[PDB]
A paper describes a structure:
GTPases K-Ras, H-Ras, and N-Ras comprise the most frequently mutated family of oncoproteins in human cancers, including three of the most lethal forms, cancers of the lung, colon, and pancreas. Here we present an inhibitor R11.1.6 engineered on a scaffold based on the thermostable protein Sso7d for preferential binding to K-Ras G12D and reveal an extensive hydrophobic interface on K-Ras that can be exploited in future inhibitor development. To better understand their molecular interactions, we obtained co-crystal structures of R11.1.6 bound to GppNHp-loaded K-Ras G12D and to GppNHp-loaded K-Ras WT at resolutions of 2.20 and 2.30 Å, respectively. For both mutant G12D and WT structures, the K-Ras/R11.1.6 interface consists of switch II in a conformation that selectively exposes its hydrophobic residues, which are intercalated by a series of aromatic R11.1.6 residues.
Numbering used by the authors:
A (entry chain B): 1 to 6, 9 to 36, 39 to 58
B (entry chain A): 1 to 166
Amino acid sequence: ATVKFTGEEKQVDISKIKWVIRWGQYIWFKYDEDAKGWGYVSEKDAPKELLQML
Amino acid sequence: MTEYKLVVVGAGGVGKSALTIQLIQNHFVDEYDPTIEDSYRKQVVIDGETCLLDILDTAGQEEYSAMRDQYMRTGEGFLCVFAINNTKSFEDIHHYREQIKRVKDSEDVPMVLVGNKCDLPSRTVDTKQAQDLARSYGIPFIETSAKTRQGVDDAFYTLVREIRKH
Ligand SMILES: Nc1nc2c(ncn2[C@@H]2O[C@H](COP(=O)(O)OP(=O)(O)NP(=O)(O)O)[C@@H](O)[C@H]2O)c(=O)[nH]1
Ligand SMILES: [Ca+2]
Ligand SMILES: [Ca+2]
Ligand SMILES: [Ca+2]
Ligand SMILES: [Cl-]
Ligand SMILES: [Cl-]
Ligand SMILES: [Cl-]
Ligand SMILES: [Co+2]
Ligand SMILES: [Co+2]
Ligand SMILES: [Co+2]
Ligand SMILES: [Mg+2]
């Protein structure tokens, strides 16, 4: 799957996400390869595949 | 009013995770040490009203500062924890508070001062120091022990009350 999040609009393949939690109606995640980073998306905007990794 | 986003912050080792786990599991889990922040939900009754605590137990060493900031913007209430045998943890409080205020761009954010480990046979932070500091912030101070559970419900419930009165 792809996770789309935002002060710019970015995207990351869910295969790169190493960590994810649900808090305060948002989904919080980290991603890495070898780009490395973090992002967050509302609970109602997150892909099924991401929710499944909770 | 039904859901409350609580953030737990404080220096490494003060008992952020121990306190959170005492609230959730109603006992002291020894050797519990998540390295990354984690969230916990609990249904509780506070002053009649049933409500959902959505609790973020922050990492000792948050890797992303902007991620720390976004957590703070999203949180409604903050448990600022120090340990009564660690003066450094207590001096940190001043900076947690004004960092939180800076980041949420607000002069009045719901907070509670927590001095954990009051089961310990020694003190380096005097009760007077913490009470004077809390009074200057106009917030509650609650001395706790995640080991004995002394003050634990009280610390989280009082934070909810600070939120209810905005
Ligand atoms: N005596 C006593 N020890 C405590 C108490 N709360 C936590 N500790 C101990 O102090 C240490 C730190 O606890 P911990 O819960 O990991 O603190 P933390 O603030 O979550 N650490 P980190 O920020 O690195 O996640 C552990 O050895 C724990 O057992 C308390 O109320 N009394
Ligand atoms: Ca970035
Ligand atoms: Ca130990
Ligand atoms: Ca206030
Ligand atoms: Cl130890
Ligand atoms: Cl600071
Ligand atoms: Cl005690
Ligand atoms: Co709320
Ligand atoms: Co148990
Ligand atoms: Co400062
Ligand atoms: Mg911890």
